[PDB]
Amino acid sequence: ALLGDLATGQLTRLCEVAGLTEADTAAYTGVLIESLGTSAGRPLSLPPPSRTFLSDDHTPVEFSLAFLPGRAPHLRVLVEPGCSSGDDLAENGRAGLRAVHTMADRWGFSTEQLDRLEDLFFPSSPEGPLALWCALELRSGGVPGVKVYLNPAANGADRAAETVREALARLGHLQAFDALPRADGFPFLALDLGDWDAPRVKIYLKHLGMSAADAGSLPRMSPAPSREQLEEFFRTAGDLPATGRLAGRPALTCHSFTETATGRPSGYTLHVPVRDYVRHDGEARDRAVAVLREHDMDSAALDRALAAVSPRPLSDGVGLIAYLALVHQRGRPTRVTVYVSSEAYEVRPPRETVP
Template sequence: MTPSRTSGGSTRLTKTLGRFTADQLRRLCDVVGLDAADAETYASVLAESLGTAAERPLDLPPPSRSFLSDDHTPVEFSLSFQPGETPTLRVLLEPGCDAASLVDNGRVGLRVIHAMTERWGFSSHRLDHLEDLFFPPASQGPLALWCALELRPGGVPRLKVYLNPAASGPERAGETIREALGRLGYQQAYTALPPADGYPFFALDLGDWDAPRVKIYLRHHNLAVAEAGSLPRMDSGPEQATVEAFFRIAAGYHSGTRSGAGTSADARLCGLPALACHSFTETTTGLPSGFTLHIPIRDYVRHDGEAHARAVAVLAHYGMDATPLARSLAAVTSRQPADGTGLIAYLALAYERSRPPRVTAYISSEAYGLRPLAAPLSPRTTPLLNSLSRLPGHRPRSRHRQE
């Protein structure tokens, strides 16, 4: 907590970004069964990784216009679900969020990653081998480096690093990805990727992974149901109907029609684009070993009550218990779901070779504010979704989108 002066000259305590997000993380650790010692370790790592931004009072604006979240909080949480298991908690953050420039942002991020790898005995050689590609002298784009911690019992997480393929310009993003894949031994991987409208992230697993991945994220504007089903390129991957079912439920097209969107069969995402992730773990075939489809659910609901209902429906469809999700939402905020959109930012369906499917819900910290409520949609035939519009406090507002 940081002391501040009131207009009358008395001193009060103002909550800081680090304290606010670390407290959220502690409560989330309790939801997934991590003990108090692990929760304290991970909360400390989060605050330390934010650097000087951690001490920034929340009554000041965000340290930067971070692309990581709609309200520019440089922290996001997620829960990854599998059938019959306790969900895995993750935290995504931008270490260089208060840097003076994108170049400095990247330098700070690299220092934090190297400190993490030294602390936990991880190797950073794959990241170091790509430094010139993703950290040029004049970086471009909305980000330089993000990192995610997958929190495990024992206080040693799994680490993921997210880099910007357009650091040398969006026109060179594909070339940068091809070169990076080649350097890491995946010479054939780039040709396995489907056509896309952009490459927002290049990601690496660092640390104690059974099979460390290289992940390429693709942006797909106006994605239709059938197109989503055809995106996976992995051998023995999900069936087209499985991906299409997830798309329909998550985007709200599983019954009836949406205003301006056509029927369930030809529905498209006309707001924020879907993201597809193709992960690679072996170099022999050049084919991905994993596939994930991310739906930006916050842009396709009227409020978070509807987003939560969609998430529950997705989890039920894949045989997963949704109870921890409700507890997690309560752990990060006391506001009512009908008061805004964006608390659940994305829903994702993930497949990896020889593993059951995973569903991930991405939960916003909302340290700096709420995303405004969406405009009302036309009536639906689903009773559950119709009933959500009658929740107390639902006040339609103009729609706001931010990518």
């Protein structure tokens, strides 16, 4: 009945799929409740605490599973830690920053990169659609990896490009902005905080009407990923035959920068919002397991994860599987990520057709 109790039940069942110990599970359920603030105790019969863009039903939680061949998926959870402040973006941002800085203190990492950007991303009268989200990578040992997501449009959508250009300059990535491919918008900037082999600055780009061929040409990273693999992923995720475009909710690309010498990204991820291109989650699950099997990943663990989040039949709604992503990063194996919704407030109805 309370938001924190649904969310921590779902997290608990997901930690089991990910193979985390009881100790680490208990740790991370605590962290999730702390991240929700007063909203953790909010009855689910009341409206969401904010009209957050984090999920379609405004649950301020979303999970994701990152798959590699030969092992269990890695589990991650995305939260709006200022959600208890509601829809006032300045107050929601201030509360979210306070949560991240509490995490940084607790786990002993620096926020200097974030702090350098604060005035760009947290102006006095910010514009939507978000102020601050946080994702936690739920690593064995109970000390998570921390990622923060900021709004390039905070100073107005017309200033998003300028804001991203300035952020990249402040972080020392003076060639990165001009390395990005063209796009239709800059919806997010994200930072890896804390202990990472190579922490990334991540720039997210929106592409309206992307085709399969476009999905394989948009990488800017060195070395370039396989075009054929990207095209096939896009076709499978959108159910496009071998014209065909994703002209509803747009596909996004993410370009990651981890070192400043090359001037080039070290990563590219293609994100397909599959929820807008299926009749129901049985179709989205079928597409997700097709991608997983193509890349020699553990699709039965996805099936277990879906049942961990929700007991409903997959065909009784749409939006449980929010996004599918194919992830390339320099010197790392290709990874597939599935983003799974909490559906604490609504189950969107199934569709008779997808036009």
